Design a protein around this ligand. Structure first.
Ligand SMILES: [K+]
Ligand SMILES: [Mg+2]
Ligand SMILES: [Mg+2]
Ligand SMILES: [Mg+2]
Ligand SMILES: [Mg+2]
Ligand SMILES: [Mg+2]
Ligand SMILES: [Mg+2]
Ligand SMILES: [Mg+2]
Ligand SMILES: [Mg+2]
Ligand SMILES: [Mg+2]
Ligand SMILES: [Mg+2]
Ligand SMILES: [Mg+2]
Lengths: 172, 185, 222, 159, 58, 51
RNA sequence: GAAUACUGCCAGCUGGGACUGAGGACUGCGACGUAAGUCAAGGAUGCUGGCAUAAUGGUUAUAUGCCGCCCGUCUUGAAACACGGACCAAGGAGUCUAACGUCUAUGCGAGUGUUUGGGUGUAAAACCCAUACGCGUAAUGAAAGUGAACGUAGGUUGGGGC
RNA sequence: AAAUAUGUAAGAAGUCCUUGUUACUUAAUUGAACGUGGACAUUUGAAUGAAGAGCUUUUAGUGGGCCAUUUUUGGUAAGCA
């Protein structure tokens, strides 16, 4: 389910005689498949408007691919989530090459640090930070220093066999 | 597992053979099995099913009942078929000349039918001369006229006969049967 | 010359003209499906060109698989599963989409997986697991003459005619669908794909409406 | 001890409606019931004669007998494992016609009219009602209706 | 030693085992409870219309 | 006496569906579609890329 | 302007492995062939090898892996820290009768029932039988009593069969 | 003033048009109920299913219950009632 795609979902109220041509509400949804994307669209129209799936219609669902999937981007992600004893807004930043994988990173991050399931999270916004110094979190800003380079000490090498004859080393 | 909507391994509830050991009846059943299979006439199927019936489901058919059935228009020349016994009836004083095919004729019934100019016939001769049940008329006797049926469904206000050995005053004609003694049924 | 060849040649000539009828029907059904698919694709392209949106027709047909066993079912869903003819696990039936049937599926949702079958799924299902209900017995189709003997009054002469009367919900859909015995499917060959079946498909489970993914599920199940 | 009288537990359903007490309006008494009419039982609490038992509040039945001021209504009552025929003698205060059977009778007339026209022109008039069908295709124009909507909203205290 | 007082548990399952059946309405229902003046009239109306039918048919 | 599945046993697949011979002889299962140069509209593209 | 990913389709081709071979003349649907025929088309054949006996197989004892609480009973619940049971043989518990209900079989049937008794006998059998009597063919009422066709033994609605 | 649960209807035992019965009803040749004759066609008037559908007789055991989700009373509570 975490292999997230981003869909645009455009829906509307069913046309009636008083109001033909309704207003075509459009949302950006992160979900694994189109069924979950449509369900999430109706869930949000249910909460934000007086619209439900019975008295509504989906006029379009389209997948949005990344414009430049092999370009490294800094993404600020505003979310609200329900903790065990309240509701909270947070801002986080993920350095990643695509919005979908940045959302994957945030869902894993939010599950790891706050024990917050996909059930409990609303993605308020995912935005590219255009330039450095608008980055605010040190854990991302530390990766933006010039001539970035670092070793990887203590290499642990996976062994194909039960027994080894060489007393392995961790050089790298 | 299966969610069974109906009871499993349920017998049809219908007789497929006579309950008796009469070999002549079993020969008749064999003949009308062959006829009910190789002929499409529903007469042979109805006769075959009637050949399986018990005694209470084969009430006797009187000659007066046959004469009344022959008073029907278009039925003067028909062959009356009784899968059972034709009993006698002295209540009548004229009998039409006709052909009756039955399992059994009482001595009085056979004498009355033959004296009227007609003939008594068995179901096998019926099969021989009317293989498809041509111009036959199947008659059945009264099934609810049985004395046991009077007591079926006994209960308050049902108007049925109690199961009783001695009849008269002092035998269940008191409290529960009249308003002056408690209540009435 | 005991008069065997005359009726044998009459029967072969009748069989040949019946097969010519089935062949010309199947050709016209193939062109009908081909244009039905190409028109929808070209309609979406035209709507994109004009800046509008083409909302497709809502799906007229679903395929429903009972994915739950027979123990501990409340009476109302138990009755609806009996009415949809899903009496054992991994049984399947086709359903025409109406408000009445959609409320039936909305009422047995935790016990079934349903969705919108494709032509390939319906064709392979009917060819491989299609049995007819003939004189209350479950008869393998295996022949066009059986389907013509039981559905010939409705103009359904072959298995392809039956498949078309299912994929397009025709006038005689109810008779053709009830003539089909409930499909007895096997467990999916690659599993269900989820740790736990008895959540909704949206919630990472298996039951509910998974509309277009029912094709992959049913293909693995047969 | 327990109490199970005739009008027990009828405190609210034999109320009159709020600001609807007093005398009954004459259209109750000008309604004509024939044998075979289908009627709904709802007791008027201000008339204590011919009053149905609490069980039959809301039941719908068929009129079998018509008397001076009352009708005989047949109701099927579930007793044990079967339905028992129950015969009620109710004053017309507690009785109204079934409006559903009124639209059924009107639909019968409309069906006859449709078949009558189709017998002359336009055969295959297809009388039967059909359930709500799935929608057909359509083209939703965007011109003047450009889609525009935002995302979910942040949490706020509002206290 | 007190026991259980009452429960309707299993009663609906028992009731539905042999189904709950409608009372099998007939054409020409019984005239029991119908107004006696109507019944007295209807006997004579039926007698007269059968007389007219038999007189016409002969 | 024995149910022989189609989709294999081309003899049975030809006993049913005589059109399967024409379908194979013409490769209708791999039909090449006509190239169409119908572009999407700018309002559609801009709406899709809109935040 | 292409490629590819992803998803989907093919009545596209093909390699390896496993279990099964039910039926037992023919009939059918087919397919390839101008036909004549042929076939993978309503269920396995062909070829080859070894042994022809404890070899396979059965039984039995044992070992090994995994599983397996003591039966009977009362009970919501028994392996129970509930009761009966040390072991074995033999015996050991829904019978017959009077009257009766439903169902079934048989005989005869507006009747039916010989067997109280008589006759007879190859002698507790078998065979034969008069008059009665029981039940039934009439009900209802406390009783005195009275006591069943207006009609093709009625009309209406269904109704098998003809 | 919900949700859930709950009654009824969705036709042939029907509808319409004439004119027949009556001791009931009307001021009335008005109705009521039941009819004769005539017309309505195969979508005989929503969906899905129906495993055969109805009906009858007769008889066994049972008439200590207990558990779980949800609703819920007494009780501080209870593997309580
Ligand atoms: K008690
Ligand atoms: Mg595997
Ligand atoms: Mg009073
Ligand atoms: Mg163990
Ligand atoms: Mg024990
Ligand atoms: Mg213990
Ligand atoms: Mg003890
Ligand atoms: Mg001891
Ligand atoms: Mg002892
Ligand atoms: Mg012994
Ligand atoms: Mg003994
Ligand atoms: Mg007890």
């Amino acid at each position: 389910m975490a292999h997230f795609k981003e869909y645009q979902v455009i829906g509307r109220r069913l046309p009636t005689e008083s109001v033909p041509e309704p207003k075509l509400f459009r949302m950006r949804i992160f979900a694994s498949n189109e069924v979950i994307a449509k369900s999430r669209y109706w869930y949000f129209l249910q909460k934000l408007h007086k619209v439900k799936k019975a008295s509504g219609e989906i006029v379009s669902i389209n997948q949005i691919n990344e414009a430049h999937p092999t370009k490294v981007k800094n993404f600020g992600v505003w979310v609200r989530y329900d903790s065990r004893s309240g509701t909270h807004n947070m801002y986080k930043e993920i350095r990643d090459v695509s919005r979908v994988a940045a959302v994957e990173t945030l869902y894993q991050d939010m599950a790891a640090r706050h024990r917050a399931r996909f059930r409990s999270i609303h993605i308020l916004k995912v935005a590219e930070i255009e330039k450095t110094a608008d980055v605010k979190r040190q854990y991302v800003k530390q990766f933006l220093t010039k001539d970035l380079k670092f070793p990887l000490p203590h290499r642990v090498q996976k062994s194909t066999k039960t027994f080894s004859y060489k007393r392995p080393s961790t050089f790298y | 597992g299966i969610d069974h909507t109906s009871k499993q391994h349920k017998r049809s509830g219908h007789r497929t053979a006579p309950k008796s050991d009469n070999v002549y009846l079993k020969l008749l059943v064999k003949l009308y099995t062959f006829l009910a299979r190789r002929t499409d006439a529903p007469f042979n199927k109805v006769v075959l099913k009637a050949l399986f019936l018990s005694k209470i489901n084969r009430p006797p058919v009187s000659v007066s009942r046959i004469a009344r059935a022959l008073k029907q228009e278009g039925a003067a020349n028909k062959t009356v078929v009784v899968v059972g016994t034709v009993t006698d009836d002295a209540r009548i004083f004229e009998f039409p000349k006709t052909t009756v095919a039955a399992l059994r004729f009482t001595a009085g019934a056979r004498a009355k039918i033959v004296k009227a100019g007609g003939e008594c016939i068995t179901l096998d001769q019926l099969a021989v001369r009317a293989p498809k049940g041509q111009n036959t008329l199947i008659l059945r006797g009264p099934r609810n006229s049985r004395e046991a049926v009077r007591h079926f469904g006994m209960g308050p206000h049902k108007g049925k006969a109690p199961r009783i050995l001695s009849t008269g005053r002092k035998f269940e004609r008191a409290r529960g049967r009249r308003r002056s003694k408690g209540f009435k049924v | 010359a005991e008069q065997v060849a005359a009726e044998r040649a009459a029967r072969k000539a009748a069989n040949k003209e019946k097969r010519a009828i089935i062949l010309e029907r199947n050709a016209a059904y193939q062109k009908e499906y081909e244009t039905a698919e190409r028109n929808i694709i070209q309609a979406k392209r035209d709507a994109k060109a004009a800046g509008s949106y083409y909302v497709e027709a809502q799906h007229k047909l679903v395929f429903v698989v009972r994915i739950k066993g027979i123990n501990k079912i409340p009476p109302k869903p138990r009755k609806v599963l009996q009415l949809l003819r899903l009496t054992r696990i991994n049984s399947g039936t086709f359903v025409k989409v109406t408000k009445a049937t959609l409320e039936l599926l909305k009422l047995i949702e935790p016990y079934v997986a349903y969705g919108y079958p494709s032509y390939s799924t319906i064709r392979q299902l009917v060819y491989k697991r299609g049995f007819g209900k003939i004189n209350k017995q479950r008869v393998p189709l295996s022949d066009n003459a059986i389907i013509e003997a039981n559905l010939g009054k409705y103009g359904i002469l072959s298995i392809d005619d039956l498949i078309h009367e299912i994929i397009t919900v025709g006038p005689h859909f109810k008779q053709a669908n009830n003539f089909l015995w409930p499909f007895k499917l096997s467990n999916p060959s690659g599993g269900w794909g989820v740790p736990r079946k008895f959540k909704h498909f949206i919630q990472g489970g298996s039951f509910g409406n998974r509309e277009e993914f029912i094709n992959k599920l049913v293909k693995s199940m047969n | 001890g327990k109490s199970h009288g005739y009008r027990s537990r009828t405190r609210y359903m034999f109320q009159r409606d709020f600001r609807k007490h007093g005398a009954v309006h004459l259209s109750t008494y000008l309604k004509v019931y024939k044998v075979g009419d289908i009627v709904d039982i709802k007791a008027n609490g201000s008339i204590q004669k011919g009053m149905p038992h609490k069980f039959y509040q809301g039941k719908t039945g068929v009129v079998y007998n018509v008397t001076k001021s009352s009708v005989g209504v047949i109701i099927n009552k579930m007793v044990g494992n079967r339905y028992l025929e129950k015969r009620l003698n109710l004053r017309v205060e507690h009785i109204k016609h079934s409006k559903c059977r009124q639209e059924f009778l009107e639909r019968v007339k409309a069906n006859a009219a449709k078949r009558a026209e189709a017998k002359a022109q336009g055969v295959a008039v297809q009388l039967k009602r059909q359930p709500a069908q799935p929608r057909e295709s359509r083209i939703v124009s965007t011109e003047g209706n450009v889609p525009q909507t935002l995302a979910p909203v942040p949490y706020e205290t509002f206290i | 030693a007190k026991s259980k007082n009452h429960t309707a548990h299993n009663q609906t399952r028992k009731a539905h085992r042999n189904g709950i059946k409608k009372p099998k309405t007939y054409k020409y229902p019984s005239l029991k409870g119908v107004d006696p003046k109507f019944r007295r009239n209807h006997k004579h109306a039926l007698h007269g219309t059968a007389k007219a039918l038999a007189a016409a048919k002969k | 006496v024995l149910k022989k599945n189609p989709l294999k046993n081309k003899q049975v697949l030809l006993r049913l569906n005589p059109y399967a011979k024409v379908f194979a002889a013409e490769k209708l299962g791999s039909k090449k579609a006509e190239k169409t140069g119908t572009k999407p509209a700018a309002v559609f593209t801009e709406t899709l890329k809109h935040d």
